[PDB]
Paper text:
Despite the ‘rule of thumb’ that blood feeders from independent evolutionary lineages utilize different protein families for various salivary functions, the saliva of sand flies contains apparent homologs of the two-domain long-form D7 proteins of mosquitoes. In this study we demonstrate, using binding studies and bioassays, that the sand fly long-form D7s do in fact bind both cysteinyl leukotrienes and thromboxanes, and thereby serve as anti-inflammatory and anti-hemostatic agents in both sandflies and mosquitoes. Consistent with these structural observations, the sand fly proteins were found to perform the same anti-inflammatory and anti-platelet functions as their mosquito counterparts through the binding of cysteinyl leukotrienes and TXA2 in the N-terminal domain, but do not bind biogenic amines, as this function is performed by the yellow proteins.
The structure of ABI15936 was determined using single anomalous diffraction methods with a selenomethionine-substituted variant protein prepared in E. coli. The C-terminal domain appears generally like those of the mosquito proteins but does not contain the biogenic amine binding pocket seen in AeD7, the Ae. aegypti long D7 protein that binds both eicosanoids and biogenic amines. The N-terminal domain of ABI15936 contains two disulfide bonds that are conserved in the mosquito proteins. Although ABI15936 was crystallized in the absence of any potential natural ligands, electron density was observed indicative of a non-protein molecule occupying the N-terminal domain binding site. This was determined after refinement of the protein complex to be the detergent Triton X-100, which was retained through the steps of protein purification.
Numbering used by the authors: 0 to 196, 198 to 230
Amino acid sequence: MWRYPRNADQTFWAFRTCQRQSEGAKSLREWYRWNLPNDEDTHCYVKCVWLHLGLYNEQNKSLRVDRIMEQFNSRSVAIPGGINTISGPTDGTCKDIYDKTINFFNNNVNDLRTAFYGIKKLSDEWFTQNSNTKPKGTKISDFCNAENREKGGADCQHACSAYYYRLVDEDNEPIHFRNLNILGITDEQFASCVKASNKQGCKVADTMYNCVEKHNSQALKILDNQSPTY
Ligand SMILES: COCCOCCOCCOc1ccc(C(C)(C)CC(C)(C)C)cc1
């Protein structure tokens, strides 16, 4: 189950993963400077980030406004105006989620960057002060191979790696919406790994890891190679 607020590693992972899933987009460079143009790839990039931050409720097709407000409160940022526009059900499309949130973004850019660690100084400070989280510039394998982290406190083999690959969350529950298609893992294959993982504790992590690797032996290697900055 997802934890709130989101930390600077968790927000960074959401931005970077969604950028990789749209890496051929015309507007990629604009996203890097916190500009979100009105085009289809940007619409779906925005939906992806809301989802990967844990702030899109797939059951009711609505933003988790309670958790968005919690992010601001926990970061000591004033709640912005225009929350009504971002609230309520969408029709599920990227276009609708973009249209509901673009003015909220445009009208609060720097407060949003503060709340979601989108400023280099604030992110750097979080990472320096949270040394038990994988640092920027360090591979998942190298970080998780240290301090016996892969044991997960117990007898596991991939407890840390499965978390940083976002196969499981902090509760060792599978992340159901993870998209590994470009790595050669279809939605059906990933779903089968989720289903295979009544397991308990870090054994969920190990089962996810071993199942993904069985489907494609390079998929997790590619994530590890991408992992210094995701
Ligand atoms: C090389 O590293 C570049 C990393 O860039 C990370 C920053 O990402 C660019 C900004 O993209 C977004 C994506 C979504 C959003 C939304 C609209 C979802 C708002 C948010 C993040 C405050 C919830 C805002 C900016």
